[PDB]
Each structure stands twice: as structure tokens, then as C-alpha cells.
């Protein structure tokens, strides 16, 4: 977290996108950050979400917005435990800036992802 903070601290200077190797490194970076995020102590959960939000807000060009992991996050049934929360918070994170939630370009078809969302509603 300190390395990603000190490298994102200089916008307008050494842009991470456009580099023909750091693109395919940063996608692995972003998917790892989206993977390991939960952390049952509530206080640094918000810091993890803030690091993800600042990352997508600053990079924004090498897109690679990864699906089906949020779908695995919120597709879980049995409405007694809040295991679907991370999917909708992270979808709000990717939605609230830009970048539409278009499913059927890489992941699943659009006709079922929205239904999964409405079904957990």
C-alpha cells in the first residue's frame, strides 16, 4: 500500500498507462487489489476501497475493468450474511466515476448480470 501510494502520488508525471508492459502489469495489480479486499476489521476496509477508487480514478486509460469476480462476490444466496456487500460497493466504485457496467464484451451476457443484481435487491 505504501508503494502504490508513493507511485500514484505524482499525476501528470510518468503516466502508468500507455507503457506497453506496465499495462499488462497494472491489470494484474488491479485484479489482485480487487481480489484481496475484505479484511473483517472495519477501519482499513475503507482504506482498501479508497486505494481502489484512487487507482481507477487516476489510471483510467488502460481500462481492463474486470468482471465475474464482482459477480462471484454478490451472486451468493442465503440472505442471512452480508457476503454480497463487496460486489455492490465495488460496482458503485467503478460506476460513480465513469465507465459503464457493460457486461457482454468480455465477461457474461448482460441479460443475467443485471438480474443477479435485482435478485439480491
Amino acid at each position: 500500500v505504501e508503494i502504490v501510494a508513493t507511485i500514484l502520488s505524482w499525476t501528470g508525471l510518468a503516466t502508468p498507462t500507455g507503457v506497453p508492459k506496465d499495462e499488462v502489469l497494472a491489470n494484474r495489480l488491479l485484479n489482485f487489489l480487487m481480489k484481496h479486499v475484505f479484511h473483517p476489521k472495519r477501519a482499513v476496509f475503507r482504506h482498501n476501497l479508497e486505494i481502489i477508487k484512487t487507482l481507477v480514478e487516476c489510471w483510467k486509460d488502460c481500462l481492463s475493468i474486470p468482471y465475474r469476480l464482482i459477480f462471484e462476490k454478490f451472486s451468493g444466496k442465503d440472505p442471512n450474511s452480508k457476503d454480497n456487500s463487496v460486489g455492490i460497493q465495488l460496482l458503485g466504485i467503478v460506476m460513480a466515476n465513469d465507465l459503464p457496467p457493460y457486461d457482454p464484451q468480455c465477461g457474461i451476457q448482460s441479460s443475467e448480470y443485471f438480474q443477479a443484481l435485482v435478485n439480491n435487491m
Side-chain angles (χ1 to χ4, degrees), residues 83-121:
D83 302 342
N84 316 109
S85 321
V86 194
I88 55 175
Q89 273 110 28
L90 188 54
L91 188 48
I93 283 181
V94 66
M95 190 58 163
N97 170 38
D98 273 319
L99 315 173
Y102 64 101
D103 316 318
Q105 269 65 20
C106 297
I108 329 165
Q109 286 277 322
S110 45
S111 299
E112 212 274 337
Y113 179 79
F114 290 142
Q115 220 290 322
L117 184 39
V118 167
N119 202 4
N120 67 65
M121 178 201 169

Side-chain angles (χ1 to χ4, degrees), residues 12-22 24-27:
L13 276 156
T15 62
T17 81
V19 177
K21 281 179 54 59
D22 200 65
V24 307
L25 289 157
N27 304 347

Side-chain angles (χ1 to χ4, degrees), residues 8 26 53 96 116:
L8 292 159
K53 178 179 191 177

